[PDB]
């Protein structure tokens, strides 16, 4: 018997202002950049670390 609040829920969603394209795009480029950099750095790190342990 409880009235569904989903109608008022979707109403608030329609009033939500969405960010622009350039901001999200540049942000995605930043995230991808950090991800790639950290990936390469850690790959080289644990790579030469494995190469170091293998000598022992």
């Amino acid at each position: 018997a409880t009235v569904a609040f989903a109608r008022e829920a979707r109403t608030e969603v329609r009033k939500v202002i969405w960010p622009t394209r350039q901001e999200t795009l540049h942000t995605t480029l930043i995230v991808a950049a950090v991800t790639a950099v950290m990936s390469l750095i850690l790959w080289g790190l644990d790579g030469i670390l494995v190469r170091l342990v293998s000598f022992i």
Binding site: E12, K15, P19, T24, T27, T35
Partner: protein, 416 residues
């Protein structure tokens, strides 16, 4: 990168990750990681896979960190639990930061005790159960004490590393350590994916669709997290009431996410705890019951996905509701003489904000639920490895976005 101030912090964090890596590549004496890694290839090692993701891959190598930073988070859960239940800690918490240091000390000590107990349980229970199947070392009190003290020193040094990165560097130590540990497994996954692609075992088009879908999820969740609902309010006329002219915020922003990985990690610990405690017995009655109920919750099983999704919803909603305080906002608008069209200032304004956030954080949690749901079905359909899992992606995205947000915040604060 240009500023030397942030450069020193960056080199400090990276160096800390180097030390942590070297420390994580050192296995526990008297323990062979080869038979362990071979054991994880079976279905009985798939249940501990999700627990291995938070260990930075140091579980299979049997490093000085058995559970990783998980027992610290679990200790925080226990501390908060005792804070909610026992009013004694609640009174001390209300005594100011002087009591917060006490809660701190008791949290670290609790982390120590949990580290000891878990060390005992793990080291004694699983290997010596057959016994001596995986380990050559006899089930004596020497191995027990050694493993205990070793895991204790490891967890302690890990917490120390977490405190050093937090203090002398930007961002949280636990966050960047977990992040690094998760993204450390991505390059071998990609490499092995490419190597097996030329063998005809894995199609190139599949990998392409996976990458495209990953980029799509990325762009999507990035677009969502920065999405916000602003409340327009025009105030105030009549400049001689000693409040105007503002020269203040003309709109009140409302964010869907805080954002933080804390609810994700906490929920992960909560859900994986019964799976962790039941994973100590591989054979015997544990195989007939504990292993079965351990198979009840699996990353490959939809049930665990749904349960973890509900956990994400609950924890994120509770955390979002806890962080944002309508009281302080209403008091801030009251002292400044802000009058919301739309409204009248008072407790009625606090009820409105809660009403909006209730309809916001809900569908936000639905979005997060969807984003977390997709990569599992994608893993089932496209047979992608476990490094592409939804939880890892969510953790990575949240950590990176929040860290960059903090960086831009510090740059904005240093500007004007």
């Amino acid at each position: 990168g240009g500023l030397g101030e942030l450069k020193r912090r960056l080199l400090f964090v990276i160096g800390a990750l180097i030390v942590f890596r070297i420390g994580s590549f050192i296995p526990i004496p008297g323990i062979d990681a080869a038979v362990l890694a071979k054991l994880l290839e079976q279905q009985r090692g798939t249940i501990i896979e999700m627990f291995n993701m938070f260990s930075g891959g140091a579980l299979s190598r049997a490093s000085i960190f058995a559970l990783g930073i998980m027992p610290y988070i679990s200790a925080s859960i226990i501390i908060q639990l005792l804070t909610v239940v026992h009013p004694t800690l609640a009174e001390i918490k209300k005594e100011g930061e002087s009591g917060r240091r006490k809660i701190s000390q008791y949290t670290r000590y609790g982390t120590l005790v949990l580290a000891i107990f878990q060390s005992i349980g793990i080291a004694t229970g699983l290997p010596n159960m057959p016994g001596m199947q995986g380990l050559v070392i006899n089930p004596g009190f020497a191995f027990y004490f050694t493993a205990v003290v070793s895991l204790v020193t490891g967890t302690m040094f890990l917490m120390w590393l977490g405190e050093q990165i937090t203090e002398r560097g930007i961002g949280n130590g636990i966050s960047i350590i977990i992040f690094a540990g998760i993204v450390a497994g991505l390059p071998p996954a990609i490499a092995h994916t490419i190597e097996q692609a030329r063998q005809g075992d894995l199609h190139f088009l599949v990998l392409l669709l996976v990458a495209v879908l990953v980029f799509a999820v990325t762009f999507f969740v990035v677009f969502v997290e920065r999405g916000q609902r602003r409340i327009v309010v025009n105030y105030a006329k009549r400049q001689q009431g000693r409040r105007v002219y503002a020269a203040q915020s003309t709109h009140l922003p409302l964010k869907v996410n805080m954002a933080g990985v804390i609810p994700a990690i906490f929920a992960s610990s909560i859900i994986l705890f019964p799976a962790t405690i039941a994973s100590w017995f591989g054979g015997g009655t544990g195989w007939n019951w504990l292993t079965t109920i351990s198979l009840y919750l699996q990353p490959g099983q939809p049930l665990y996905v749904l349960l973890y999704a509900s956990a994400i919803i609950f924890f994120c909603f509770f955390y979002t509701a806890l962080v944002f305080n309508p009281r302080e906002t209403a008091d801030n608008l009251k002292k400044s003489g802000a009058f919301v069209p739309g409204i009248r200032p008072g407790e009625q304004t606090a009820k409105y904000i809660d009403k909006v956030m209730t309809r916001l954080t809900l569908v936000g949690a639905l979005y997060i639920t969807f984003i977390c749901l997709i990569p599992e079905f994608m893993r089932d359909a496209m047979k992608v490895p476990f490094y592409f899992g939804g939880t890892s992606l969510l953790i990575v995205v949240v950590v990176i976005m929040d860290f960059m947000a903090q960086v831009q915040t510090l740059m904005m604060s240093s500007q004007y």
